[PDB]
Amino acid sequence: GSQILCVGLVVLDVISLVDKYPKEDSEIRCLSQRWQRGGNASNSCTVLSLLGAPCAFMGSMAPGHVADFLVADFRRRGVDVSQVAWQSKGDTPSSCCIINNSNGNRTIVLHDTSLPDVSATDFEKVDLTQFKWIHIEGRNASEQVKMLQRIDAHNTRQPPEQKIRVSVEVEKPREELFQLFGYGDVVFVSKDVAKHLGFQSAEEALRGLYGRVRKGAVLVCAWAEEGADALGPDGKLLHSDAFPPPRVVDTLGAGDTFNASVIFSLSQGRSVQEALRFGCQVAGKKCGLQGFDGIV
Amino acid sequence: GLVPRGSQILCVGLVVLDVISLVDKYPKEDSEIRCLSQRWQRGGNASNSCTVLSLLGAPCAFMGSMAPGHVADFLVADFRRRGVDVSQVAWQSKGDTPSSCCIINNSNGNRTIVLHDTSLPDVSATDFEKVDLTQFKWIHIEGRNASEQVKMLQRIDAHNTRQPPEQKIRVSVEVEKPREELFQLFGYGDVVFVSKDVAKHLGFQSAEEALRGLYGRVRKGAVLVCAWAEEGADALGPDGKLLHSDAFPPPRVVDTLGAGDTFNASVIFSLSQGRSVQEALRFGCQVAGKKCGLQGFDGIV
Numbered sequence: 001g002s003q004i005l006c007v008g009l010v011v012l013d014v015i016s017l018v019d020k021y022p023k024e025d026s027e028i029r030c031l032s033q034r035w036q037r038g039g040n041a042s043n044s045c046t047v048l049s050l051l052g053a054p055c056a057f058m059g060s061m062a063p064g065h066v067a068d069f070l071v072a073d074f075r076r077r078g079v080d081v082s083q084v085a086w087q088s089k090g091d092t093p094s095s096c097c098i099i100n101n102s103n104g105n106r107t108i109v110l111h112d113t114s115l116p117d118v119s120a121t122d123f124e125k126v127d128l129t130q131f132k133w134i135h136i137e138g139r140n141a142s143e144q145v146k147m148l149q150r151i152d153a154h155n156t157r158q159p160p161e162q163k164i165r166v167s168v169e170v171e172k173p174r175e176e177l178f179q180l181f182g183y184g185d186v187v188f189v190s191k192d193v194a195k196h197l198g199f200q201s202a203e204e205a206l207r208g209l210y211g212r213v214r215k216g217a218v219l220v221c222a223w224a225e226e227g228a229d230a231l232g233p234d235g236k237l238l239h240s241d242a243f244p245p246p247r248v249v250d251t252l253g254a255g256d257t258f259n260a261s262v263i264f265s266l267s268q269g270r271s272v273q274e275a276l277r278f279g280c281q282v283a284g285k286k287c288g289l290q291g292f293d294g295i296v
Numbered sequence: 297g298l299v300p301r302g303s304q305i306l307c308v309g310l311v312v313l314d315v316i317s318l319v320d321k322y323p324k325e326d327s328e329i330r331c332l333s334q335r336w337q338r339g340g341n342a343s344n345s346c347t348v349l350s351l352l353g354a355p356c357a358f359m360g361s362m363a364p365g366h367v368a369d370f371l372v373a374d375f376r377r378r379g380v381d382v383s384q385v386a387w388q389s390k391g392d393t394p395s396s397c398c399i400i401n402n403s404n405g406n407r408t409i410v411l412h413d414t415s416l417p418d419v420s421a422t423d424f425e426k427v428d429l430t431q432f433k434w435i436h437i438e439g440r441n442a443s444e445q446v447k448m449l450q451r452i453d454a455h456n457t458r459q460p461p462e463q464k465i466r467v468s469v470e471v472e473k474p475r476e477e478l479f480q481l482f483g484y485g486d487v488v489f490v491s492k493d494v495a496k497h498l499g500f501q502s503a504e505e506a507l508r509g510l511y512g513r514v515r516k517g518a519v520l521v522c523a524w525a526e527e528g529a530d531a532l533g534p535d536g537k538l539l540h541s542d543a544f545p546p547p548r549v550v551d552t553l554g555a556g557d558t559f560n561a562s563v564i565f566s567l568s569q570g571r572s573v574q575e576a577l578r579f580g581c582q583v584a585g586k587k588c589g590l591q592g593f594d595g596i597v
C-alpha cells in the first residue's frame with residue numbers, strides 16, 4: 001500500500017516555443033525546441049515523483065527508439081514502469097506542441113497511432129496490494145469500467161485502512177466516458193467537458209453533475225485561471241483561487257499537475273479544501289516554468 | 297572504412313527533421329486537435345541532394361552540423377537507410393539538431409511552418425580545414441554562412457591549384473535564399489545554381505532574364521543554372537549560349553517537396569559523369585519531373 005498508480009497515455013511531445021502563435025499559411029521561426037514525455041497519466045506520474053510520492057505508470061507502448069526515450073525519462077524520474085502494456089502492433093503516439101512564449105498558451109496536434117489501449121485483461125494481471133491510490137485517465141470507458149469493478153471487488157475484501165482510493169479523470173467531451181462519473185472516490189471533470197454539457201462555471205458544473213457520481217464521492221472541476229471547485233456528499237461547494245505566476249510561460253500539463261497534486265494531497269490525509277488549494281498552487285507554479293523542473 | 301581517392305560527391309549544408317501533420321482544419325490557439333496523418337522526414341537541401349545522389353548510384357557524403365541526441369539518431373539512421381556517408385558530420389556540443397513543424401490543411405492545401413531554431417552552429421571554415429579532400433571528386437555547397445563558406449571555397453581552389461586537371465575537385469554552389477550575404481557565393485564554383493525565388497526577389501521575371509542579368513557575377517568559365525519549376529530550366533556558360541530544357545511533368549503531381557534538390561543532385565550527377573551542360577539540364581528536369589509524381593524519393597530511378 002505504498003504506490004500511486006496512474007493508468008492512461010504516454011505520448012512524445014515535440015515542443016516548439018514561439019514568440020507569437022503562427023497565422024495559417026505563414027512561415028515563422030521558433031525560439032527553442034525540446035522533447036518532453038507527455039500524456040495525462042504520464043505527466044501526473046512526473047508531478048507525483050517530484051512531490052515525493054512512489055508512483056507507477058500503466059499504459060501502452062510499442063518497442064522502439066521513442067519508447068526508449070520515454071522509458072529512460074520515466075526511469076530518470078523514479079517512475080515504476082513494470083506495469084507498461086508492451087504492444088506488438090502500432091507506433092507510440094507523438095504530438096506537435098506549439099507553446100506561445102508571450103502567454104504560455106499551448107496548442108497540440110496529436111498523432112494517435114491507434115496503439116491498443118490497456119485492457120481489463122491487462123489490468124487483471126496487476127498486483128493491487130502495492131497501491132494505496134489508483135488514478136484512471138478516461139479513454140476506453142467500457143474496458144476501464146471493468147478495471148474499476150475489479151478495484152471495488154478487492155476493497156470489498158479489505159479492512160477500511162487497507163482500501164485502495166480511486167480517482168477518475170473525464171477530460172474529453174466523449175459520451176462513452178460519462179459512465180466513468182459513477183466510479184471512484186474522486187472524479188475530475190475538465191472545464192471543456194463542463195462547457196460541452198452547457199455549464200458556464202465550475203459551480204454550475206458541480207451542481208449539475210453531482211447526481212452522476214457514486215455515494216460519498218468528491219466531484220472536482222478546475223476552471224483554469226478562475227481557480228478550482230470541489231463538491232462532496234455534505235453538499236458544500238469548496239473553492240480555491242488560482243495561483244497565477246506573474247508571467248505565464250508554459251501551460252502544457254497544467255491540468256495534469258493539478259490532478260496529481262490534488263491526488264497527492266488527499267493521499268497524505270489532507271482535507272478536500274487543502275487539496276484543492278495545493279492543486280492550484282502547484283498548477284500555478286508550473287505555468288511559470290518550462291516543463292516540470294522546479295515545481296517543488 | 298576505406299573510401300577510394302576522388303570517388304565521392306560531398307554536399308555541405310542543412311539537415312533537418314521535418315514533422316509533417318495533415319489536419320482537417322487549422323488548429324485554433326490553445327486547442328488540442330487530432331491530425332489525419334503525421335510523418336517524420338529528413339529534410340534540408342544538401343541532405344535531400346545526398347538522398348538523390350545515392351539513388352542515382354553515386355557514392356556521396358554529407359557534411360553538416362548535428363548535436364548528439366534522439367533527433368540526430370533518427371536523421372543519422374535515415375541518411376544510412378539512403379546509403380549516405382555521414383563520417384564528415386560536424387558534431388556540436390551546443391545547440392539543438394534542427395527540427396521543423398509543418399501543418400498541412402487538408403481542406404485547402406495550405407502549409408503553415410514553424411521553422412527550426414537557430415541555436416546550432418553552422419559548419420565553419422576551421423571545421424572544413426580538418427577535412428582530407430582527396431576522397432571527393434565534386435563538392436556542392438548549399439549557401440548558408442556565406443563568409444565562412446567563401447573560405448571553404450578558397451581552400452578547394454588552393455587544393456586544385458596543385459592538382460593535375462584530372463584530379464581537380466569540381467565545385468557547385470546553391471544560392472536558394474534571398475539573403476544579400478549569399479550573393480558573394482556567385483563568384484565561386486564551376487556550377488552556380490540560383491533559385492526561381494532568388495531570381496524573382498532580384499526583380500527577374502524568367503530564367504532567361506535571371507541568367508543574363510546575373511552571369512556577370514560568376515567566375516571565369518562558370519555555368520549559371522536556373523530551374524523555373526514547370527517552365528523548365530536554363531543554363532548559361534562562358535560561350536554566351538542560353539541552354540534550355542522543358543520540364544517533364546508527371547501524369548499526376550503528388551509531391552513537389554525536394555524537386556529543386558532532385559534537379560540540383562541530377563545536374564551535378566550528370567556533369568560528374570562527363571555529360572554536357574545541355575544533357576545535364578535535360579536529365580535534371582527528367583528526374584525532378586519523375587520525383588513530382590512520387591511521394592518522397594523512392595522510385596525516382
Ligand SMILES: C[C@H]1[C@H](O)CN1c1nc(N2C[C@@H]3[C@@H](CO)[C@@H]3C2)cc(C(F)(F)F)c1C#N
Nearest residue numbers: 222223224225227228242243244258284287
Ligand atoms: C488547473 C487550474 C486550476 O484551476 C488553477 N489552474 C490553472 N490552470 C491554467 N490553465 C488550465 C489549462 C491549461 C492547459 O493544460 C490551460 C491554462 C492556468 C493557470 C494560470 F493562472 F497559472 F495561468 C492556473 C493556475 N493557477
Ligand SMILES: C[C@H]1[C@H](O)CN1c1nc(N2C[C@@H]3[C@@H](CO)[C@@H]3C2)cc(C(F)(F)F)c1C#N
Nearest residue numbers: 523524525526528543544545552559585588
Ligand atoms: C526543378 C524544376 C525544373 O525546372 C523542372 N522542375 C520541376 N519543378 C516543379 N516544381 C518546383 C517547385 C516545387 C515547390 O517545392 C514547385 C514545383 C514542378 C515540376 C513539374 F512539372 F513536374 F510539375 C518540375 C518538372 N519537371
